[PDB]
Amino acid sequence: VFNKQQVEAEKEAVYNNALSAQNDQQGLLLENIHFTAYRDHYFGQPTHGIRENLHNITDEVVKNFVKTNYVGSNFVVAAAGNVNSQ
Amino acid sequence: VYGKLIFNNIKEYTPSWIKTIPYSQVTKPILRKQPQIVGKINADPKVKKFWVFLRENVQ
């Protein structure tokens, strides 16, 4: 359940994560090569998202995203180790 | 044109008094594929096959 207050609380954390993405230099450079390789597609945009848009996310946007994307055909559950198959 | 000379006493690379535009003004990208600007001669599939042959046999 995605409450508005929880999204408001997590906005700061998400923004801080986006800003701190530069700590992992290799990861930020991988995001940069993705951006430069695909300029005419949203696939080039950074995974952490556009900073100025992070504060624009609402509960409804998250709910719509999860409803329209987390579908049965998209779920793969893999198990390994000491697990009983049946 | 910007203003007075500022010496090295200002530690920050970007002085505070400069203006930074908001996110509204910056233009957004058009993240869609656009029609190719190609002439009649090169649009012919035979010419494309000739280009590929030249690329992968002599070039």
Binding site: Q45, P46, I50 | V26, G39, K40
Partner: peptide, 30 residues
């Protein structure tokens, strides 16, 4: 056609023969 490029390009909005923006533009990389 071969000469159609000149005819089509004649209809362009350019400042004194130079294709420039009509207002300030700023681009940022996310």
């Amino acid at each position: 056609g071969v000469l159609s490029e000149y005819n089509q390009r004649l209809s362009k909005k350019l400042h004194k023969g130079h294709l420039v923006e009509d207002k300030p533009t700023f681009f940022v990389t996310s």
